[PDB]
Amino acid sequence: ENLYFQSMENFNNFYILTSKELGRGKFAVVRQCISKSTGQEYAAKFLKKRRRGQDCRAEILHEIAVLELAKSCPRVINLHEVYENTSEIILILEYAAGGEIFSLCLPELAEMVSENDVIRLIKQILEGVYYLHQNNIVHLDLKPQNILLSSIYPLGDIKIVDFGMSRKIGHATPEYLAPEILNYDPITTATDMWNIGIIAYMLLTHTSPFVGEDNQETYLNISQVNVDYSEETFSSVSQLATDFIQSLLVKNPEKRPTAEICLSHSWLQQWD
Numbered sequence: 001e002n003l004y005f006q007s008m009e010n011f012n013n014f015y016i017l018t019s020k021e022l023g024r025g026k027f028a029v030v031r032q033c034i035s036k037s038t039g040q041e042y043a044a045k046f047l048k049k050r051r052r053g054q055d056c057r058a059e060i061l062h063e064i065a066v067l068e069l070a071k072s073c074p075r076v077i078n079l080h081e082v083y084e085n086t087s088e089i090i091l092i093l094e095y096a097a098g099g100e101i102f103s104l105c106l107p108e109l110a111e112m113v114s115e116n117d118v119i120r121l122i123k124q125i126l127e128g129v130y131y132l133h134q135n136n137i138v139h140l141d142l143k144p145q146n147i148l149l150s151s152i153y154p155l156g157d158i159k160i161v162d163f164g165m166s167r168k169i170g171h172a173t174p175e176y177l178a179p180e181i182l183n184y185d186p187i188t189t190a191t192d193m194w195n196i197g198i199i200a201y202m203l204l205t206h207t208s209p210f211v212g213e214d215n216q217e218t219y220l221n222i223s224q225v226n227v228d229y230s231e232e233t234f235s236s237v238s239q240l241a242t243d244f245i246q247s248l249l250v251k252n253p254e255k256r257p258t259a260e261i262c263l264s265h266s267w268l269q270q271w272d
Protein backbone atom coordinates (compact mmCIF):
# COMPACT_ATOMS: atom_id res chain seq x y z
CA GLU A 1 0.00 0.00 0.00
CA ASN A 2 1.36 3.38 -1.10
CA LEU A 3 0.57 6.74 0.49
CA TYR A 4 -1.37 9.32 -1.52
CA PHE A 5 -1.31 12.36 0.77
CA GLN A 6 1.66 14.17 2.31
CA SER A 7 4.06 12.20 4.49
CA MET A 8 3.83 11.95 8.27
CA GLU A 9 7.32 13.48 8.51
CA ASN A 10 5.97 16.76 7.13
CA PHE A 11 3.24 16.78 9.78
CA ASN A 12 5.72 16.45 12.66
CA ASN A 13 7.75 19.24 10.98
CA PHE A 14 4.95 21.83 10.66
CA TYR A 15 2.67 20.92 13.57
CA ILE A 16 2.99 20.04 17.25
CA LEU A 17 0.40 17.93 19.03
CA THR A 18 -1.02 18.74 22.45
CA SER A 19 -2.41 16.64 25.29
CA LYS A 20 -5.90 17.94 24.45
CA GLU A 21 -8.21 15.28 23.00
CA LEU A 22 -11.28 16.97 21.52
CA GLY A 23 -13.09 13.75 20.62
CA ARG A 24 -12.54 10.01 20.37
CA GLY A 25 -14.62 7.60 18.31
CA LYS A 26 -14.07 3.94 17.57
CA PHE A 27 -11.82 4.39 14.52
CA ALA A 28 -11.13 8.13 14.76
CA VAL A 29 -9.49 10.51 17.24
CA VAL A 30 -9.41 14.32 17.22
CA ARG A 31 -6.43 15.98 18.91
CA GLN A 32 -5.48 19.65 19.05
CA CYS A 33 -2.39 20.83 17.19
CA ILE A 34 -0.62 24.13 16.58
CA SER A 35 1.27 25.44 13.55
CA LYS A 36 4.95 25.97 14.29
CA SER A 37 5.00 28.82 11.75
CA THR A 38 2.00 30.85 12.93
CA GLY A 39 1.03 29.46 16.33
CA GLN A 40 -2.55 29.06 15.12
CA GLU A 41 -4.70 26.33 16.64
CA TYR A 42 -6.09 23.60 14.38
CA ALA A 43 -7.97 20.33 14.84
CA ALA A 44 -6.39 17.11 13.58
CA LYS A 45 -8.74 14.18 12.91
CA PHE A 46 -6.85 10.88 12.69
CA LEU A 47 -8.92 8.32 10.77
CA LYS A 48 -7.94 4.65 10.60
CA LYS A 49 -7.79 3.17 7.10
CA ARG A 50 -8.77 -0.36 8.25
CA ARG A 51 -12.08 -0.72 10.12
CA ARG A 52 -13.25 -4.21 11.09
CA GLY A 53 -10.77 -5.73 8.66
CA GLN A 54 -11.92 -3.63 5.70
CA ASP A 55 -9.70 -1.15 3.85
CA CYS A 56 -11.88 1.94 4.33
CA ARG A 57 -9.52 4.37 2.57
CA ALA A 58 -12.18 4.94 -0.10
CA GLU A 59 -14.77 6.20 2.40
CA ILE A 60 -12.25 8.68 3.81
CA LEU A 61 -11.63 10.02 0.30
CA HIS A 62 -15.41 10.39 0.04
CA GLU A 63 -15.46 12.44 3.25
CA ILE A 64 -12.60 14.59 1.94
CA ALA A 65 -14.41 15.18 -1.36
CA VAL A 66 -17.45 16.45 0.55
CA LEU A 67 -15.49 18.75 2.87
CA GLU A 68 -13.70 20.15 -0.19
CA LEU A 69 -17.02 20.76 -1.96
CA ALA A 70 -18.41 22.88 0.90
CA LYS A 71 -15.27 24.92 1.61
CA SER A 72 -16.85 28.16 0.37
CA CYS A 73 -19.67 27.64 2.89
CA PRO A 74 -18.78 29.19 6.28
CA ARG A 75 -21.36 27.08 8.12
CA VAL A 76 -19.18 24.07 7.26
CA ILE A 77 -15.81 23.33 8.84
CA ASN A 78 -12.78 24.23 6.73
CA LEU A 79 -10.27 21.61 5.57
CA HIS A 80 -6.74 23.02 5.32
CA GLU A 81 -4.38 20.07 4.80
CA VAL A 82 -4.31 16.27 4.64
CA TYR A 83 -1.51 13.94 5.77
CA GLU A 84 -1.24 10.16 5.73
CA ASN A 85 0.79 7.43 7.42
CA THR A 86 0.68 3.63 7.39
CA SER A 87 -2.64 3.29 9.23
CA GLU A 88 -4.05 6.83 9.42
CA ILE A 89 -5.28 9.66 7.24
CA ILE A 90 -5.03 13.01 9.04
CA LEU A 91 -7.36 15.95 8.38
CA ILE A 92 -6.25 19.41 9.53
CA LEU A 93 -9.51 21.23 10.26
CA GLU A 94 -10.46 24.75 11.27
CA TYR A 95 -10.59 24.87 15.06
CA ALA A 96 -13.98 25.35 16.73
CA ALA A 97 -13.25 26.90 20.13
CA GLY A 98 -16.87 26.90 21.30
CA GLY A 99 -17.19 23.12 21.25
CA GLU A 100 -20.24 20.99 20.65
CA ILE A 101 -23.63 22.68 20.53
CA PHE A 102 -24.67 19.75 22.74
CA SER A 103 -23.44 21.86 25.66
CA LEU A 104 -26.33 24.33 25.39
CA CYS A 105 -28.90 21.50 25.43
CA LEU A 106 -28.12 20.86 29.10
CA PRO A 107 -30.06 22.58 31.92
CA GLU A 108 -26.67 23.62 33.33
CA LEU A 109 -26.44 26.44 30.74
CA ALA A 110 -30.13 27.22 30.08
CA GLU A 111 -29.64 30.48 32.01
CA MET A 112 -27.42 32.10 29.36
CA VAL A 113 -29.15 31.03 26.11
CA SER A 114 -32.24 33.07 25.25
CA GLU A 115 -34.84 32.32 22.59
CA ASN A 116 -33.25 35.09 20.50
CA ASP A 117 -29.97 33.14 20.52
CA VAL A 118 -31.56 29.87 19.39
CA ILE A 119 -33.22 31.71 16.50
CA ARG A 120 -29.79 32.87 15.35
CA LEU A 121 -28.18 29.44 15.69
CA ILE A 122 -31.09 27.66 14.00
CA LYS A 123 -30.97 30.15 11.14
CA GLN A 124 -27.24 29.45 10.77
CA ILE A 125 -27.64 25.65 10.86
CA LEU A 126 -30.20 25.95 8.06
CA GLU A 127 -27.98 28.04 5.77
CA GLY A 128 -25.41 25.25 5.92
CA VAL A 129 -27.95 22.50 5.32
CA TYR A 130 -29.42 24.54 2.47
CA TYR A 131 -26.00 24.73 0.81
CA LEU A 132 -25.49 20.99 1.32
CA HIS A 133 -28.95 20.27 -0.09
CA GLN A 134 -28.35 22.55 -3.08
CA ASN A 135 -25.52 20.17 -4.04
CA ASN A 136 -27.50 16.95 -3.45
CA ILE A 137 -25.61 16.24 -0.21
CA VAL A 138 -27.31 14.74 2.85
CA HIS A 139 -25.55 14.64 6.22
CA LEU A 140 -27.61 11.99 8.07
CA ASP A 141 -25.70 12.56 11.34
CA LEU A 142 -27.04 16.01 12.29
CA LYS A 143 -26.78 15.41 16.02
CA PRO A 144 -25.70 18.10 18.51
CA GLN A 145 -22.37 16.30 18.92
CA ASN A 146 -21.52 16.97 15.24
CA ILE A 147 -22.46 20.68 15.28
CA LEU A 148 -19.86 22.97 16.87
CA LEU A 149 -19.51 26.63 17.83
CA SER A 150 -16.73 29.01 16.84
CA SER A 151 -16.84 30.41 20.40
CA ILE A 152 -19.05 30.55 23.49
CA TYR A 153 -18.22 33.85 25.22
CA PRO A 154 -19.86 35.43 23.30
CA LEU A 155 -21.87 32.81 21.41
CA GLY A 156 -20.12 32.30 18.09
CA ASP A 157 -21.15 30.83 14.75
CA ILE A 158 -22.12 27.36 13.57
CA LYS A 159 -19.64 24.88 12.12
CA ILE A 160 -20.87 21.47 10.88
CA VAL A 161 -18.55 18.45 10.99
CA ASP A 162 -18.53 14.66 10.60
CA PHE A 163 -19.31 13.81 6.97
CA GLY A 164 -18.62 10.08 7.35
CA MET A 165 -22.24 9.33 6.40
CA SER A 166 -22.75 11.88 3.60
CA ARG A 167 -24.26 10.37 0.45
CA LYS A 168 -26.29 11.64 -2.50
CA ILE A 169 -30.08 11.64 -2.69
CA GLY A 170 -31.96 8.37 -3.03
CA HIS A 171 -29.23 6.19 -1.49
CA ALA A 172 -29.65 3.07 0.68
CA THR A 173 -27.39 7.07 18.33
CA PRO A 174 -30.97 5.72 18.36
CA GLU A 175 -32.57 8.86 19.80
CA TYR A 176 -31.48 10.93 16.77
CA LEU A 177 -32.81 8.52 14.13
CA ALA A 178 -35.66 9.52 11.83
CA PRO A 179 -38.83 7.43 11.51
CA GLU A 180 -38.24 6.69 7.82
CA ILE A 181 -34.95 5.05 8.84
CA LEU A 182 -36.91 2.50 10.87
CA ASN A 183 -39.17 1.78 7.88
CA TYR A 184 -36.09 1.33 5.63
CA ASP A 185 -37.70 3.88 3.27
CA PRO A 186 -35.10 5.45 0.94
CA ILE A 187 -33.04 8.35 2.25
CA THR A 188 -34.24 11.88 1.54
CA THR A 189 -33.23 15.46 2.27
CA ALA A 190 -36.23 15.60 4.62
CA THR A 191 -34.32 13.18 6.88
CA ASP A 192 -31.92 15.97 7.84
CA MET A 193 -34.92 18.19 8.60
CA TRP A 194 -36.15 15.72 11.23
CA ASN A 195 -32.82 16.11 13.05
CA ILE A 196 -33.12 19.91 12.94
CA GLY A 197 -36.44 19.62 14.77
CA ILE A 198 -34.64 17.72 17.53
CA ILE A 199 -31.83 20.29 17.73
CA ALA A 200 -34.39 23.07 18.17
CA TYR A 201 -36.42 20.95 20.60
CA MET A 202 -33.29 20.13 22.60
CA LEU A 203 -32.08 23.74 22.76
CA LEU A 204 -35.39 25.29 23.85
CA THR A 205 -36.46 22.58 26.33
CA HIS A 206 -33.02 21.16 27.26
CA THR A 207 -34.29 17.57 27.02
CA SER A 208 -34.27 14.90 24.34
CA PRO A 209 -37.72 14.46 22.74
CA PHE A 210 -37.59 10.70 22.06
CA VAL A 211 -35.17 8.98 24.48
CA GLY A 212 -36.97 6.61 26.84
CA GLU A 213 -36.08 4.39 29.76
CA ASP A 214 -34.56 1.80 27.39
CA ASN A 215 -34.05 1.59 23.64
CA GLN A 216 -37.37 -0.21 23.16
CA GLU A 217 -39.31 2.82 24.40
CA THR A 218 -37.00 5.09 22.38
CA TYR A 219 -37.74 3.39 19.05
CA LEU A 220 -41.46 3.30 19.86
CA ASN A 221 -41.63 7.03 20.57
CA ILE A 222 -39.87 7.76 17.27
CA SER A 223 -42.08 5.51 15.13
CA GLN A 224 -45.13 6.98 16.91
CA VAL A 225 -43.89 10.60 16.90
CA ASN A 226 -44.74 10.73 20.62
CA VAL A 227 -43.31 14.08 21.74
CA ASP A 228 -43.83 15.96 25.01
CA TYR A 229 -45.58 19.19 24.00
CA SER A 230 -47.19 19.76 27.41
CA GLU A 231 -47.53 23.18 29.02
CA GLU A 232 -45.06 22.26 31.78
CA THR A 233 -42.30 21.91 29.16
CA PHE A 234 -43.28 24.84 26.90
CA SER A 235 -44.57 27.26 29.55
CA SER A 236 -41.61 29.51 28.68
CA VAL A 237 -41.31 28.78 24.95
CA SER A 238 -43.01 30.90 22.29
CA GLN A 239 -45.83 29.46 20.19
CA LEU A 240 -43.95 30.34 16.99
CA ALA A 241 -41.13 28.06 18.11
CA THR A 242 -43.68 25.30 18.74
CA ASP A 243 -45.18 25.71 15.26
CA PHE A 244 -41.64 25.55 13.89
CA ILE A 245 -40.83 22.25 15.61
CA GLN A 246 -44.15 20.47 15.08
CA SER A 247 -43.96 21.26 11.36
CA LEU A 248 -40.72 19.24 11.30
CA LEU A 249 -41.39 16.34 13.70
CA VAL A 250 -43.86 14.46 11.51
CA LYS A 251 -43.61 10.85 10.38
CA ASN A 252 -44.18 11.49 6.65
CA PRO A 253 -40.95 12.89 5.14
CA GLU A 254 -42.80 14.45 2.20
CA LYS A 255 -44.74 16.67 4.62
CA ARG A 256 -41.65 18.18 6.26
CA PRO A 257 -40.69 21.56 4.76
CA THR A 258 -37.42 21.98 2.94
CA ALA A 259 -34.45 23.98 4.20
CA GLU A 260 -35.56 26.82 1.91
CA ILE A 261 -39.07 26.99 3.38
CA CYS A 262 -37.75 26.81 6.95
CA LEU A 263 -35.78 30.03 6.46
CA SER A 264 -39.16 31.67 5.71
CA HIS A 265 -40.83 30.63 8.98
CA SER A 266 -42.29 33.59 10.86
CA TRP A 267 -40.26 32.51 13.91
CA LEU A 268 -36.92 33.37 12.27
CA GLN A 269 -37.93 36.86 11.05
CA GLN A 270 -36.78 39.59 13.44
CA TRP A 271 -34.16 42.33 13.46
CA ASP A 272 -31.28 40.96 15.55
Ligand SMILES: Nc1ncnc2c1ncn2[C@@H]1O[C@H](COP(=O)(O)OP(=O)(O)O)[C@@H](O)[C@H]1O
Binds near residue numbers: 045077095
Ligand atom coordinates in the same frame (compact mmCIF):
# COMPACT_ATOMS: atom_id res chain seq x y z
N1 LIG B 1 -12.89 21.02 14.19
C1 LIG B 1 -13.16 20.69 15.46
N2 LIG B 1 -12.92 21.56 16.46
C2 LIG B 1 -13.21 21.18 17.72
N3 LIG B 1 -13.70 20.00 18.07
C3 LIG B 1 -13.95 19.09 17.10
C4 LIG B 1 -13.68 19.42 15.77
N4 LIG B 1 -14.02 18.36 15.01
C5 LIG B 1 -14.48 17.39 15.84
N5 LIG B 1 -14.45 17.84 17.12
C6 LIG B 1 -14.83 17.14 18.20
O1 LIG B 1 -14.58 15.76 17.99
C7 LIG B 1 -15.80 14.98 18.13
C8 LIG B 1 -15.83 13.85 17.14
O2 LIG B 1 -15.43 14.33 15.87
P1 LIG B 1 -16.21 13.71 14.54
O3 LIG B 1 -15.80 14.54 13.28
O4 LIG B 1 -17.68 13.79 14.74
O5 LIG B 1 -15.79 12.18 14.36
P2 LIG B 1 -16.56 10.83 14.72
O6 LIG B 1 -18.05 11.14 14.90
O7 LIG B 1 -16.37 9.85 13.62
O8 LIG B 1 -16.01 10.25 16.04
C9 LIG B 1 -16.92 15.99 17.83
O9 LIG B 1 -18.12 15.61 18.48
C10 LIG B 1 -16.34 17.27 18.42
O10 LIG B 1 -16.63 17.32 19.82
Ligand SMILES: [Mg+2]
Binds near residue numbers: 145146162
Ligand atom coordinates in the same frame (compact mmCIF):
# COMPACT_ATOMS: atom_id res chain seq x y z
MG1 LIG C 1 -19.41 12.30 16.34
